[PDB]
Design a protein around this nucleic acid. Structure first.
Ligand SMILES: O=c1ccn([C@H]2C[C@H](O)[C@@H](COP(=O)(O)NP(=O)(O)OP(=O)(O)O)O2)c(=O)[nH]1
Ligand SMILES: [Ca+2]
Ligand SMILES: [Ca+2]
Ligand SMILES: [Ca+2]
Ligand SMILES: [Ca+2]
Ligand SMILES: [Ca+2]
Ligand SMILES: [Ca+2]
Length: 901
DNA sequence: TCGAGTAAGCAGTCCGCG
DNA sequence: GCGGACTGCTTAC
């Protein structure tokens, strides 16, 4: 086994490293690492070190890390560049692990924990830690055990021991339904007092010191609470035992309007699962409570209890502890599905960074590029201060709002990374500039050729063609990695569709799911056996295929995120390689590429249709074009098709065999025009959309930029068992839209696209008639709530107070004098409802914490005074009116001459 | 919302528009 | 009543 690091820290002149040694054992060492930095030197040297621009450098070896840091300072005092990796632990890792790191996750201690704190006087602030910690559940991945630390005696009540036998029992037996698969993995430890609980927890921690530390809100709540509580009871030295190097720092986390405190534990890598989820899930949720996210991800039921959480330990300690254990398990279940810890480990070891730095693509890419350059004895430039400046982005075509019956979309492969590679865009490949023509002139190929020597972008930048830049080289590596995982994702998706088809005809038999790899397209043999399976086995297979698809999605979309973020880092002032010339070279080239191929596709289709100046491309955004295929379908005639799948096959074949070759030809000419290094503009068919054959469905519609809906039959080679709605930007897709209204609007759209106007009209009439019966949470709007205090003038709305903030102020007055009532937290999300005139709350709306039932204090009154008429008009009718007017149809039947019959 | 980027939509406030 | 100027928020890419 090759060695690999677990954690690394700088503490003064020492590097403290935890690592796995060649024998698979965890070790710790302190190293008096002597860093090197670099200065430019005269050309007449015998040096082996050169900067990225090929200027010679001399290496300066320092007695210690403080000397190196002091030197950087003095070089600024003198006004000269201090080159090299200034984050010395990254240089340490580069020197100590000078090879592609192979890590073994079974040796990495991943701890998942959650604490309970009974509090009678509101939220227990971690900075005060004034209340006893009365439960800790700590799961250790190496032991595969849930360690439960239970406080039986507290100022807030003495309780009996938790019973594992009651915990395992069904809720219908009066039990807690702790999952059978973890029952034997629980190690239960009750305590007579909190001091003993905390002392044993620290002994346990010393024995099983986390490398990766996670859980839900652990960084913002559990870790600072535990640290500060131990600090209050025992003193600082004892609290610092949470760090394997006994070093901690209170860290101030700042944002635009306020700040908060977290505890940095040296030698631990904290990856709070809420933050992994927010960065890597590609969702925007109405609530980030663990209950809400667990229900969403796992389809598990909310953990039910009577009374407020502040009284749960005293009234039902049995359930209190069982729910603490279940909470820890739910995070493990979410990670089994989403695999964000696996992702973070992969990325972190790839880049050779502290694992917690995966949250920062700037840090990640700084390390990747440094390591790549170091291999060639090249020296990275010093980071510099830059003022924040706006720069231009992508092109989005203004669509004509309309219905669109048959639509084929086409999409460029990882566009911005492909532009970087094609043009060869990198800090050290800048060759110079040329005189720019208006963009229109390049799009129409009328402008003079930018260069006969260098590779160009239409922003005026020129790049060397003799060798790949470090940015192209390194982005290519991660791009290639993504390609593999996207393959697994799509195979799993196609395999899912095979199971969905078979589920129409399930055999009557007692059966087992097939032992297969869902990452690869099912063989003919597997397909034959599937057609003979029971519904029970097929559903299990479908669940497994969909889990495989999620696994692939995580791996691929987040490698996409990483490479897109290298582009974005080029336009962030804190990146070592920040350069607006390069960031703009990418975006301006993208604008040209899309509009150039719009022209080429229009020309090609006008030719094949023997027509003049017809606009076949109806829409485009960044890297995609949407093509009207009505005329292609009409040239065959609808009556000639056997079924929907027949015309879908026809369009699929037309796109692959006819359009893609012409698109390729168009892009190769563009490459020659810009004299690029390598042709990498690969635009493939994405979606095939249209109404079911013989129906009155409209197929699709656009209301404006970034707002459209399509009935899709085939997406990137996946032929759906049932057509799938692709809806972008519309209210069905927004977390701010009420849950029941997303559902209703989606059905309105389904009916529009698949069935037609009459079907839409019958559904609307029914929804309007019944909507007042819907649960208040399902019809509440959602919003983030920032700057509550800014708009709070003596408890009332100040000038220009936002609607949702107004609601929060209404809520705050209504719960005034209640320390127990849930508080709205600055920066979190709220549910919002409008209120009828003359209500007792004194205003037109009310808001309360999202993911929660409104407190019983005011629930009855909110329900009584909820303005259903305003709710319906604003969240449902207005957007529907938008969809229908765009699609040129009516959601209500207009009067006709037949009416008098 | 500590953590790569820009484009661009809609809700709502304020207030003009004879 | 609707638009523009503006803030706030959320989406597409
Ligand atoms: O989060 C994003 C998304 C997109 N983009 C830019 C870069 C990207 O290459 C371009 C196109 O984005 P898409 O999301 O359409 N996907 P891309 O072409 O990168 O990859 P894929 O092959 O999946 O579409 O828009 C970002 O900068 N950040
Ligand atoms: Ca809890
Ligand atoms: Ca793409
Ligand atoms: Ca594609
Ligand atoms: Ca069958
Ligand atoms: Ca795309
Ligand atoms: Ca192709």
């Amino acid at each position: 086994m090759k060695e690999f690091y677990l954690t690394v820290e700088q503490i003064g002149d020492s590097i403290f490293e935890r690592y796995i040694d060649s024998n698979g054992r965890e070790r710790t060492r302190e190293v008096e690492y002597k860093p090197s930095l670099f200065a430019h030197c005269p050309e007449s040297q015998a040096t082996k070190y050169f900067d990225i621009y090929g200027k010679p450098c001399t290496r300066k070896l320092f007695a210690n890390m403080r000397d190196a840091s002091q030197w950087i300072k003095r070089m600024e005092d003198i006004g000269l560049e201090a080159l090299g990796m200034d984050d010395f632990k990254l240089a340490y890792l580069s020197d100590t692990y000078n090879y592609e790191i192979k890590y073994d996750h079974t040796k990495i201690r991943v701890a998942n924990f959650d604490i309970e704190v009974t509090s009678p006087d509101g939220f227990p602030e971690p900075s005060q830690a004034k209340h006893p910690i009365d439960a800790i559940t700590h799961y250790d991945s190496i032991d595969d055990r849930f360690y439960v630390f239970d406080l039986l005696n507290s100022p807030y009540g003495n309780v009996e021991e938790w019973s594992i036998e009651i915990a395992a029992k069904l809720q219908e037996q009066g039990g807690d339904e702790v999952p059978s698969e973890i029952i034997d993995k629980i190690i239960y430890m009750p305590f007579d007092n909190e001091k003993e609980l905390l002392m044993e927890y620290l002994n346990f921690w010393q024995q099983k010191t986390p490398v990766i530390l996670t859980g839900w809100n652990v960084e913002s709540f559990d870790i600072p609470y535990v640290y500060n509580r131990i600090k209050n009871i025992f003193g600082e030295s004892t609290a610092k035992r949470l760090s394997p190097h006994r070093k901690t720092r209170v860290k101030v986390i700042e944002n635009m309007y306020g700040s908060r405190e977290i505890i940095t534990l040296f030698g631990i890598s904290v990856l709070d699962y809420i933050d992994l989820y927010k960065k890597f899930s590609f969702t925007n949720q109405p609530s980030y409570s663990l209950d809400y996210i667990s229900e969403f991800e796992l389809n598990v039921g909310k953990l039910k209890y009577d009374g407020p959480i502040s009284k749960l330990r005293e009234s039902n300690h049995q359930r209190y502890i069982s729910y603490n254990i279940i909470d820890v398990y739910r995070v493990l279940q979410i990670d089994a599905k989403r695999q964000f810890i696996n992702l973070s480990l992969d990325m972190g070891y790839y880049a050779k960074i502290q694992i917690q730095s995966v949250f920062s693509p700037i840090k990640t890419w700084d390390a990747i590029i440094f390591n790549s350059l170091k291999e060639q004895n090249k020296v990275i430039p010093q980071g510099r201060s830059h003022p924040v400046q706006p720069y231009p982005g992508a092109f989005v075509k203004e669509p004509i709002p309309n219905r669109y019956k048959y639509v084929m979309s086409f999409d460029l492969t990882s566009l911005y990374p492909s532009i970087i590679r094609q043009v060869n865009i990198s800090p050290e490949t800048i060759a110079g500039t040329f005189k720019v023509a208006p963009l229109h002139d390049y799009i129409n190929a009328v402008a003079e050729r930018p260069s006969d020597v260098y590779s160009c972008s239409p922003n005026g930048m020129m790049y060397y063609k003799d060798r790949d830049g470090v940015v192209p080289t390194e982005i290519t590596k991660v791009f290639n990695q993504r390609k593999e995982h996207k393959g697994y994702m799509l195979a799993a998706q196609r395999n899912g569709e095979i199971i969905k088809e078979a589920l129409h005809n399930p055999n009557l038999s007692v059966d087992e799911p097939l032992d297969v790899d869902y990452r690869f397209d099912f063989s003919d043999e597997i397909k034959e056996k599937i057609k003979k399976l029971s519904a029970k086995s097929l559903n299990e297979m479908l669940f497994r295929a969909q889990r495989t698809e999620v696994a692939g999605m995580t791996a691929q979309i987040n490698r996409k995120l990483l490479i897109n973020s290298l582009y974005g880092a080029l336009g962030n002032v804190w990146f070592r390689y920040y350069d607006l010339r390069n960031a703009t070279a990418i975006t301006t080239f993208g604008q040209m590429a899309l509009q150039w191929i719009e022209r080429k596709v229009n020309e090609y289709l006008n030719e094949v249709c023997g027509t003049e100046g017809e606009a076949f491309v109806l829409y485009g955004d960044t890297d995609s074009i949407y093509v009207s295929a009505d005329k292609i379908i009409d040239k065959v005639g609808e009556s000639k098709f056997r079924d929907t799948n027949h015309w879908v096959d026809f369009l699929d074949k037309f796109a692959r065999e006819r359009m893609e070759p012409a698109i390729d030809r168009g892009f190769r000419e563009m490459c020659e025009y810009m004299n690029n290094k390598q042709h990498l503009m690969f635009m493939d068919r994405e979606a095939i959309a249209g109404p079911p054959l013989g129906s009155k469905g409209i197929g699709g519609f656009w209301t404006g930029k970034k707002r459209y809906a399509l009935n899709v039959w085939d997406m990137e080679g996946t032929r759906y068992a049932e057509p799938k709605l692709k809806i972008m930007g519309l209210e069905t897709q927004k977390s701010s839209t009420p849950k029941a209204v997303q559902k209703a609007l989606k059905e309105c759209i389904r009916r529009m696209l698949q069935e037609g106007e009459e079907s839409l009209q019958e559904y609307f009439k029914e929804f309007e008639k019944e909507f007042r019966q819907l649960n208040y949470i399902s019809i509440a709007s959602v919003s983030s709530a920032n700057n509550i205090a800014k708009y709070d003038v003596g408890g009332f709305p100040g000038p220009k107070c936002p609607f949702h903030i107004r609601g929060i102020l209404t809520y705050n007055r209504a719960i005034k004098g209640n320390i127990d009532a849930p508080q709205v937290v600055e920066g979190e999300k709220v549910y919002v409802l409008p209120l009828r005139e003359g209500n007792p709350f004194g205003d037109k709306c009310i808001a309360w914490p999202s993911g929660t039932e409104i407190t019983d204090l005011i629930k009855d009154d909110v329900l009584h005074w909820m303005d259903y008429t305003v709710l319906l008009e604003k969240t449902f009718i207005k957007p529907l009116e938008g969809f229908t007017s765009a699609a040129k149809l009516d959601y209500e039947k207009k009067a006709s001459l037949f009416d008098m019959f």
